[PDB]
Design a protein around this ligand. Structure first.
Ligand SMILES: C[C@@H](O)[C@@H](O)c1cnc2nc(N)[nH]c(=O)c2n1
Ligand SMILES: C[C@@H](O)[C@@H](O)c1cnc2nc(N)[nH]c(=O)c2n1
Ligand SMILES: C[C@@H](O)[C@@H](O)c1cnc2nc(N)[nH]c(=O)c2n1
Ligand SMILES: C[C@@H](O)[C@@H](O)c1cnc2nc(N)[nH]c(=O)c2n1
Ligand SMILES: C[C@@H](O)[C@@H](O)c1cnc2nc(N)[nH]c(=O)c2n1
Ligand SMILES: C[C@@H](O)[C@@H](O)c1cnc2nc(N)[nH]c(=O)c2n1
Ligand SMILES: [Zn+2]
Ligand SMILES: [Zn+2]
Ligand SMILES: [Zn+2]
Ligand SMILES: [Zn+2]
Ligand SMILES: [Zn+2]
Ligand SMILES: [Zn+2]
Lengths: 163, 163, 163, 163, 163, 163
């Protein structure tokens, strides 16, 4: 068969963030991770000799990671957390009525229900798909994209999209 | 597409064992390995934000590895070895009439024909599927499980099961 | 020469924490890291065949890491942060008057001036020296201890003590 | 399911070469890489306990890598390069009229259009398939073979063949 | 003891170059490497909490690597090579009278006798010391600096300077 | 300062052996390890541009590893084990009167008291020192040699000799 894949991975494709998981009947304490992203795309060797240039993949991964890096990840779609702006701070109130308060600029609000590695990965995948531009990918006949997001060197989520 | 995978891997998911391969017309000398196990499951992001909790996968891999660790692996289904159990020892007699004798407690008797990485993997996969409980996996809509077993950092076997 | 070293390192010797650095005229946003610890000791091969048992070093590193894991690291000796404890929360007030508030149980209060990797390392080294018991180390003629603490796979601090 | 994979990878499966990419309207400066090869085959556990012996895979990978090691890779099917023999040297003329000249003995002439990691991969895969002998693979019921070629630790190409 | 070290390493701190070693009675064929650089400095925890900021070390390493990346390394102080300018090309004549010719823009002229990993390391160390500025290092009481240069994942040179 | 170090390391510099530790009042069960060796030497950059050629180090490490690979390691100097040859077998009797019996050709008899990683490392170091030849090392002004022996990726011993 003639489809081929290229992938990029680097300790440099990272965002260092704080978070905590909360879902129904469960809340854990604030902590954080070096999240690391790798990207794979399946296409064909085109007339320039590439599936797609490594440098485009690297540039797009770096960009998405840079936006996330150095914040508390706030899942705005959460069904078990309440958020309030008080002065320059976002206040987070949990089901058990415990409270956090951070400067608004420390938080990155992501359209996700939970700050789990799977849902963060889904977010990053959609972002990368937009950054690389769907029509570029189609012109090169790239039909599948996969990202891995590790929350540590021992645990990772892998999400994908057929395009 | 909406299926997602999670995987766990660590130097800690290891068992350090002695063994030798024996099949028709071939027997190698006793030696050993640090075997290492990584586990991946394919499912869907559930309402808790996970495919499945990383901590469940880690706890189950550690348990199966712990049972194997620090033994000679005895393939009880071998077609080319004869086994005797006299007093507190297991004697192994090979086709060329060479013999080994170990204290019975030093052996872990696996229901496999050869102590190859492939066959050890198949056994580990079945064990992990039992540990994780097949009905748990089904309630979360997990449909695929894969383990990699490395006999060293340079060589591994990958076995899977669709469920 | 006759001195010998043993070291242990693993992805498992980790603590996943939130923090931010603050020193005179500088404050960064809340974020987090997978911190990883490796331990090395210099001694002599003793009559049991060891510098010291690897299992002792692993057990002691795991214990110290476990205490830190899953918290916000609070540097109680900070010269640029004011701390208040009201009801069940710790409030942190910075020089620029920005504020953070966490549940008290979310914080691990370390006797350090900054939550830098260097200062966290020094604290870990002192703890491990206490855990391993200085008189045990002396009876085995261990004269040097070194820990590396990485804040990510790309950056680390190395602190030591001659004993 | 009953199919299984075995895989071999090592820093030892490398070839260190110089090259440059040239395609329509693009030429880069001469540089080099440590190319690294990993091999995976999919088959079944046979009556000897193996998908196929690891030692066969390693032996064949090392062989192909050793042929390539320590040369300038020249893509003889290039549509943007001209090659001419002058004394003991091969002269390369680019579209911009820039020129290179190397001794003949320093070039490995590969039947590829571009010295891209993708196309080098396709070359290596064919070679490996011939070295391992297609009918041996068939007798063991091996039906899929995949190689990864990395040009550095951060970027790689993955090519495959169903057989 | 109170001195501490910080270290930075990454697949990102690389330069991908072509070269060949030539010394008395020995010349090898043109090939290439992904050279990788790691930097360690020894100093003291200062009043900001750092030996020195990781970001300064990373910034300076990347800078030096970027200058070298994607060239043929030419050792201008070679006692067994002759270099001559012809049009836009540099001609290299070896002792055996074999010849190379590259465009000028494809060579990085380094003040080294041999393009060995040792001598490239010594060059990089001096450059890094100048980039980081000797008096900044002195004001922070940094007294030792060490770089590792790997020519591949399996072999490296380590050079240092006491300052 | 002008001394420099070169080191070689590879998953290929390995011996896969069985063993068990026995010392006074302690015996563990038969198991095994992939032992991995790395070698470092400190010297000076000589007139060929090297501290010493990487290829000599690699060749010597491979040789010593190859001799050990695929055996049970038998510490002939043990003060708590008794050995007897019975027909083609070596019988090992422990303090608790438990017994092992292996074909003589499965065992490599090492002049060490315990098959600990430290004592194996000491043995390997002396062997490597002999293989590289002390006078070669002296002519190049190499004054220090260090080997690391890991028994797994998480635990290692480091032994050295000033020469
Ligand atoms: C333990 C901690 O990192 C926790 O936040 C955690 C635990 N288990 C998890 N499990 C999955 N699958 N994904 C996660 O993001 C996750 N996250
Ligand atoms: C290499 C050595 O450990 C030996 O026991 C060996 C050789 N080849 C193997 N090959 C497979 N596929 N397993 C396994 N095992
Ligand atoms: C960056 C350097 O390796 C350059 O020659 C380069 C750039 N982009 C690339 N991209 C792909 N896909 N394959 C290559 O081999 C490749 N090669
Ligand atoms: C990089 C980011 O995590 C930040 O908190 C940071 C920056 N530089 C640092 N530098 C040292 N030396 N620690 C530490 N920490
Ligand atoms: C094998 C290849 O990298 C060759 O050019 C080579 C061989 N031996 C070497 N040995 C040393 N010490 N340094 C080098 O840079 C070096 N370089
Ligand atoms: C647990 C197992 O590998 C055991 O054989 C073991 C345990 N602890 C050890 N500890 C040291 N220091 N060295 C060893 O070789 C060693 N070896
Ligand atoms: Zn988490
Ligand atoms: Zn084996
Ligand atoms: Zn930080
Ligand atoms: Zn390239
Ligand atoms: Zn080289
Ligand atoms: Zn052991």
């Amino acid at each position: 068969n003639s489809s081929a894949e290229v992938s990029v991975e680097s300790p440099s494709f990272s965002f260092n963030c704080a978070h905590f998981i909360a879902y129904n009947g469960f809340r854990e304490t604030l902590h954080g991770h070096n999240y690391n992203v790798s990207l794979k795309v399946r296409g064909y060797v085109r007339d320039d000799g590439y599936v797609i240039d490594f440098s485009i993949l690297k540039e797009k991964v770096k960009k998405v990671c840079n936006k996330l890096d150095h914040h508390f990840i706030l899942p705005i779609y959460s069904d078990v957390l309440k958020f309030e702006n008080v002065k320059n701070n976002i206040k987070i109130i949990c089901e058990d009525n415990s409270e956090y308060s951070f400067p608004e600029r420390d938080c990155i609000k992501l359209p996700i229900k939970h700050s789990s590695t799977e849902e963060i990965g889904q977010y990053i995948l959609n972002q990368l798909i937009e950054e690389m531009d769907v029509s570029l990918l189609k012109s090169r006949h790239i039909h599948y994209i996969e990202i891995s997001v590790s929350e540590s060197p021992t645990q990772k989520a892998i999400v994908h999209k057929y395009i």
